[PDB]
Amino acid sequence: HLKPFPPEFLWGAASAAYQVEGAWNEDGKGLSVWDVFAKQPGRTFKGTNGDVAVDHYHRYQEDVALMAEMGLKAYRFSVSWSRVFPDGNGAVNEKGLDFYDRLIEELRNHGIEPIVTLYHWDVPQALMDAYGAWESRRIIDDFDRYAVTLFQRFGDRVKYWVTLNQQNIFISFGYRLGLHPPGVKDMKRMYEANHIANLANAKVIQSFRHYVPDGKIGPSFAYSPMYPYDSRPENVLAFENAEEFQNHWWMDVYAWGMYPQAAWNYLESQGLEPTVAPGDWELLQAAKPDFMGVNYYQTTTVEHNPPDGVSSGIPGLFKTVRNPHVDTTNWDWAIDPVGLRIGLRRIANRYQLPILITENGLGEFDTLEPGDIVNDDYRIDYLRRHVQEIQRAITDGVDVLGYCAWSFTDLLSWLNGYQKRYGFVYVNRDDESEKDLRRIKKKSFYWYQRVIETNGAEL
Template identity: 55%
Template sequence: MKFPEHFLWGAASAAYQVEGAYNTDGKGPSIWDEFSKIPGKTKHNTNGQIAVDFYHHYKEDIVLMAEMGLKAYRFSVSWSRILPNGEGEVNQEGLDFYEKVIDELQKHQIEPILTLYHWDLPEVLQTKYGGWESRHTIDAFVEYCRILFDKFGTKVKYWITFNEQNVFTSLGYRWASHPPNVSDSKRMFQANHIVNLANAKAIQLFHQVVPQGKIGPSFGYGEVYPLTSSPADVLAAVDANQFNNDWWLDVYCRGEYLERIMRLLKQMHIAPDVTIEDKKVLQTGKPDFLGINYYHGGTVKAPDTEKVITGKNFDKIDPYLMAGDAQSNTPESQLFQSVENPYLDKTNWGWEIDPIGFRIALRQVYEKYRLPLIITENGLGAFDKLEGGQVDDQYRIDYLNDHLVQVGKAISDGVPVFGFCAWSFTDLLSWINGYDKRYGFVYIDRDDYSPKSLLRIKKKSFNWYQRIIETNGGKL
């Protein structure tokens, strides 16, 4: 398989899922610190207070990244570590921490990819202003971004604005399975609009302050297939792709909402309130590239009255299938009905395994928006077993191998993909699934009940990825 020269072979993480040190060196609480205290919201009531303690282990972890030959590391900054109150006074120790991480990465020739927002809003902004339902949060976000652009603009080339806006707004405001624990479509689409404005304004500022850098959002993309060739099913799949994907990507890349979906939301009285000024803002902040997080897509048929996936059981919540309940009054239930795909196997958590869907996704996104792409997440969550000091995760190797082959094919098809960040480098906290849903190349000795030794142990996949990087994909 042929990959471009200087391809960014990387891995990704997020602050809340790895750092721990939740109240150390002046860090303020985030909405996840608070949400995880609500009994039953997360598996075994797990939280990120200690996580895998990257805060104190970053040097050791970066040495392992260097040993692996990693070319890029995507991490997120915890807003409330920089601004404990979400705005106002800067916590110098927070800035110092990320500076040390960036310097350490660069010492080992690893390109830092900095995510500005990976879901951990400062709690104060939620309680005081209503979080992403308030325009005040746009200003606070832009000020937070300005601090990081000023501080790291000369060191960091690649920046991600929002991680999976589609997922955090849907899970947080529609399905009440993420903070702020709301279940209200109108509020979700309004919060989503506020985030769109924050995204555009941050990008606009970035282009002024860091003209030599590149910035874009990371989107959770999954292609939706029709169950059959019946035109009604094909139309349902077209609608599902518009509802699940283009609704967001059109705003990012074209600066406007998809008319067909907006009309539907208006009919249902759940459309966001968009002012003339807002429309101008959305036109001004277009990304330089798109980050794509790919786990899987979905399959749909024309809607009927049968029950569809509701995502009520937190174990099985699937952020990429936002299908509603056919009996309820959701916009999806008028457009499509999610069904199982008879051709695909599933992970232990019921996520479809669909490598070819990855190639399709990359082709579709590129053809529509003509922007360079970077894979900012892809990986397999599995129950790994530590036996005799080793983890034989051949299933993860197979998964990543199959997906990377399809990325390689998409590149041969002409899609400009400039990097691949596996999710994740070390094991980490899965937001609501605890510590048993492991994704890393490096096993961390901890479980849902205790941080144990936090020892880092290379899995079989570590050596495999090392070899892939060494040969620039030649061994795929």
């Protein structure tokens, strides 16, 4: 017998501020690191950027009406720090807070639970300019002051809060790969910034207990569960390495306040472990979250990687390998819904934490057919499979608090423009112009509306 979805299950959808809002210089908003980075020649496809995006800042009432038509139970969005504190620290911008107050009131007037994400990659450029943003301990108290302001203004109306969204991505892409701001390729700097973001996460959860005593808070991790390629002992060992280095390095700090030892000793052998200060362990261990957020798209399969080896990986630790036993998307991402169940089981088995699935979805090149019809059965199929696996995980005993499909409307991607679309709601624009920004319900919109209405009772 499958257990049903629980009666207050948060059937959601999600977005991120830079990806949706526009209004990049309006109402006293300050520059974020992404306003500046995306304007560097050549960094984004066809120079696309978040100046306008899908103009949710101006069109939020129409978008919340679509959410109410769908009957969403929750909408997860992120707050743009630069709207609230244009310079990151210093004077609060009341017009910025008032946008989010208006958005929260519009949600709540339609019965939709806001899920507020503190941070989605958009630290104010002034903090970068002053002290290098996440590479300074200065950001711990600046971030905390920003979070506390939000908690004080919104904590009576928002129960569910996400702190750092996909820290592993903004830190790795920003400091190891150089693909995101600040465009650094230096693993030593990566691991120091990562440590400071860990401390900032723990500081804000501690502050949350003072200001939002009935609320629920947690980080959200971009989780690709690792698989060994096969039962070759060296491949299993590669999996142990990979899961610990890629996944436990973040989630064990979130859940337990401790880095895992093998990965720590590997980094220490390379001169890459972060600088620890007095009080750091105590802080990290004291700030227990209410849930683990999970952003999930796919699993990763790994095999042995010798010390002169690579596919991506770490010599002597693991390399990636294509999994012959899963379907692939048109971008060569795995489609692995059973992998979601595995990841959920791993989190519950390791940390005994409830899970909020903060992001999961399918990106594809959607065609707008005559009569403003988008037939995205491929998206319904992906979503369906994943939601069925969630139910299996709940039946196994995992506490899943909700599921936020990525995304509600189509939105701007960070580096690749607009054409690989993720929304329930098509936005008429493309990489060359904003067109009219009209909202058009896709077939998937109506599919999810029926999943919600029936609490997943079948799909």
